[PDB]
């Protein structure tokens, strides 16, 4: 029957050792979970199966019924055959002509082996080799380039039947140079004597197919896992990313395009008049042979075999069929009558009465000669005297010459005075054909076709397919070859136009022959296939999106982005988690759901002309802003990378100019720019500021950001965690210059900046560091964000507790949320990937015979090897130039990020910035810099309103006819009394003359209310 | 999109970008900059404009005494904005320029397929059909070298243009944060005056 | 080799970058704010 | 196995024939040559890195 | 001669520009447009 292969049939692709790396290779492999044909030895059985590419043989048995295998083309003594057998002494591999039985086997007797019934005769024996449920045998047999490979594995397993669900890589155990084809495979079984009763065992056959497999190697080098790229879209995504585990996201893996279903050839809907020539009533005499010019016509030269009756034809150029492909400017048909025995003279190179004096073909003739007996038409009782032939002539005729003169031939020296007489002969003789002549003397009509090809259009030439509409087809319209779908068109083509061209030279439409209809050619549907996945860790469920594909080509949903299957469309909207496109994002309720994105929760503010919202309370929030400052200072050597340790390639490379100096200087420039970037961002302080040994900061705690002495690197817990979170080699021609500033030195710079901002506020950035108590510095920053300093002093304990809580939470968030340092990880990954691709391009041939320079130099002489070495040199030069350009662009992006980071350090750390959201969401209080590998993390401490209360509001207060406006803050009304408060904090105060200023009167200001302005001087 | 090219639709549609713009406009007219800072605090728009006047060093009273004049001037300027946009050609040129540059880049890239690059013909099918393998492969390689060089030049130019657009988008985001989400005291960052 | 794979990867990167640019420029509001039904803005007109 | 490869497509180890042992192949040392110079005016004495 | 032909919706050539007739025609041919906007355009190179 058929069993499930599960994950078996994987073998080591080669003797190459790999440790802890994923390797993708395309070889003959058994597909995962494929149907494998399994047979039971016992009958209540060894059929001959084909071999094809390869065979995976699985054996579940305890008494070793399966003793051997037989490979070959005919499996008999007629042809050489391969035989592997286990006779209980050793495995014997014999390539000889064996005559196997209809049921060859090894008969085991009572236990001892007694009978060997596998073969009866051994012939030629070209090759011979000898090598010395509860168990599982796995074997892979393949035959490639004359080498036969056996991969073996033993795995003890307890199972009733079928393959176990366990992954085992098959180690190659035998490799033999057999040299003979294998098209049939037969297994050998051990027959148990009772009449035979085979043991109860299961043997499984799985055919190898060309498959791409991603195999995961471990530190030992064993293949611990594998992925079949063609098994399903999730495995194809794993192969595309070169990783077994894929994170949540969209991934473009391959492209779907519809192949043409069938080919249609379209050609215009007059025939050459060959009937007028061969079936003419009268034919000319040979001396006056007739010539018919044929032109401007199409002819069916295939039927020459039946252009006339009882014909006899011979072509001296190519076959009559090939005449049908060919075209010619003119065809000539010469025709005449002669005797049967003279037809042999109508051939190139002949001499005789006819060839010499009547009709002469050239020695290089390439045409056709056709002749048929015309006795019934041209012979007459009494003699047909119409047909004549020239018997005398003073010289032979030149090819295709015609002579119709009738001058008396003067055979002697006397004149003939124009009359026949002695030695004065009329030059023509009649054949006088009579029906009773022998066939040699009967008349034959003859047609000679000559094919001229001069300098002009070939107007004489030698298919039409049914039109199909709205189907992807490969079409041929009068020599226009293309692929697409043909649909009805509304374009009014002018009568002389055959095909329509859309802008940028595209074949948009064509008028069809025999119908004159204009058909629009829409290119066959093609689009990438994207894979929606919530991540293999979360779920193996997968959705598929065909980009720009209508839902007509193989739950479904049609979107502007294309046809998406595997995800259910849901009307209600959610925040986007996976991007699809066209405003649609897609995992919920144990399934993938596709929805239109919801841009935000709807929040309408209750606007009123007299209503205000004042924050009665606030909160301190610390946010991280992570900015890359530099990339790895990579350096390539153009000479070594392109031309490896060889003088010959170096001499040719020198002919390409100063490319290697330009590329090296460009990389040197980016490396110097990286050093300058780090220096600009971090070295903004003239002096190194040191935090006081006593952390008396009025209750503020900076333990998470101040450097920790106990750690052996003067780094704070937060930056130490950042270093621990981000995770990161010697090549040929490639080096990584170390950064000018060490991580310890960069951390010391960050600590100095942090000490300076903690102790002197923003003064150290402006100039000399002036000590100021941290609560007083916080009060100045609060005054800077429009909140009176008394608010902090009245709430110093609350603010310090909030600050410490936020500082703890931010380290927790950095430690708990992945991809927080993803911006820094991305640049490291991009640099590493570019380096990896550049090294990988060394193994690309670029059209050369081999990628490795030594092989092409050793096997080819320098005069010919120079072109191959040039192909490799130009390919490597182009690759290095591309890598340098990618690095230059990436360095420009990194420099922009570093400039932003330097500006943010100058305006958010060295000072308090009033730019909104430049230093974190909310009113910016301060920032703390932290070092990170190739980056800086800014901890922005910001002030955010927490509790908001409504208040009735008046623009001005009317007192004794005068209008009073708040000097600072706004007027508020809790519902009984009016007060003056700062806008960013609810601290109501009685309306007085010291906090309000009088302007104009009450009859100009619109929307004001009456109240009493208490004058402090009055009481 | 007929020669192996594709134009992926933008993630945010025209209506959804308009909805984001409408939300920002409502936030500015209803809360001033408080919605950008955090929770939206309801503010009277004349009072919000009065504090914005206070932000540029002009006392709040001048707006209240001249509220009608300011409103008339603001409405007239907003009306003039439509006239300026609709009556000045090339006013939207800064966007049309990038759209045209992308279109020209695609047009040149697909016109480069018509190029021979020294091969006997630009069309791959005819040269493959009419040439034997050991010279057809040389011609195909020459066309592939030319086409790949054209594609790489187009990709590099697109990357440079993308960097320029990335800088422009960063400036636009900074302008949205500083001018729209708040009030900017850096002169000429959000217009003259 | 993977020359065209590099080109396709770069083009995919620029497309994602355009998406990120639009998201960064326009999605600066956590919640969609709706204008009040009545336009009582003290004489200022926002109909345009 | 007969020879080992690195993470990249480069050979890190080989199984030496004639002894059946494992030999690590390290790319033999190479590097750039830089010259520390205070300037022709200051001094002609230079150092080689 | 090089001619810039304006094919209408019907495919009929409704107008043409002789690229060598005059510098304005050279500008029209270089711009690949029948109407050139205000400005300076580089059409060809003069050499002795
Ligand atoms: C506050 C006010 O007067 N609003 C009006 C508005 O209703 C009208 O649509 C617009 C016409 O452009 O003129 C203004
Ligand atoms: C082509 O010939 C067919 C019959 O052979 C006829 O039906 C059709 O109208 C012809 N088309 C032309 C002449 O365009
Ligand atoms: C998978 O995700 C869960 C949370 O969804 C997490 O706890 C777990 O560590 C993740 N495992 C891996 C291997 O990523
Ligand atoms: C896509 O397919 C649907 C269903 O067959 C059809 O209604 C629709 O018009 C098609 N769209 C296009 C552009 O062909
Ligand atoms: C303000 O909020 C903080 C944190 O929510 C709280 O601890 C504090 O008691 C609040 N103060 C007032 C006056 O409501
Ligand atoms: C700051 O918090 C840390 C948390 O472990 C604590 O050990 C330290 O004592 C705190 N510092 C002060 C000054 O309270
Ligand atoms: C409003 O404020 C007044 C004066 O401080 C106070 O007496 C009164 O209880 C408050 N009323 C309300 C509704 O809060
Ligand atoms: C606000 O509008 C109401 C009408 O809804 C009006 O009665 C009141 O006087 C207005 N107040 C102000 C301050 O404009
Ligand atoms: C060298 O140094 C001297 C004095 O320090 C200075 O005048 C001169 O310009 C420098 N350069 C050269 C090339 O002499």
Residue numbers in the entry:
A (entry chain A): 27 to 70, 80 to 145, 152 to 173, 186 to 247, 257 to 331, 334 to 526, 529 to 620, 641 to 672, ...
B (entry chain C): 854 to 1046
C (entry chain C): 757 to 804
D (entry chain B): 563 to 611
E (entry chain C): 273 to 320
From the manuscript:
The spike protein of the SARS-CoV-2 binds to human angiotensin-converting enzyme 2 (ACE2) through the receptor-binding domain (RBD) and changes the conformation to fuse the viral and cell membranes, mediating viral entry. Here, we used a structure-guided strategy to engineer an inhibitor peptide with mutation-tolerant and potent binding ability against all SARS-CoV-2 variants. We named the peptide CeSPIACE (COVID-19 eliminative Short-Peptide Inhibiting ACE2 binding). For engineering, we determined approximately 2 Å-resolution crystal structures of CeSPIACE or its intermediate-stage peptides complexed with the RBDs of several strains, including WT, Alpha, Delta, BA.2, BA.5, or XBB.1.5.
We determined the cryo-EM structures of CeSPIACE complexed with spike ectodomain trimers whose RBDs were BA.2 or BA.5-type. Another docking complex was observed in the BA.5-type spike, in which two spike trimers docked via seven peptides at three sites. Most particles consisted of the docking complex linked at all three sites, suggesting that triple-linked complexes are more stable than single- or double-linked complexes, which have wobbly sites. The crystal structures and peak retention time in gel filtration indicated that CeSPIACE certainly dimerized in physiologic solutions, but the cryo-EM structures suggested that CeSPIACE has stacking properties that allow it to dock two spikes. The stacking number of CeSPIACE varied, but relatively numerous peptides may render sufficient flexibility to dock two spike trimers distorted by the potent binding with CeSPIACE. Head-to-head complexes similar to the cryo-EM structures would form on the viral envelope, implying that CeSPIACE can bridge separate spikes to aggregate viral particles.
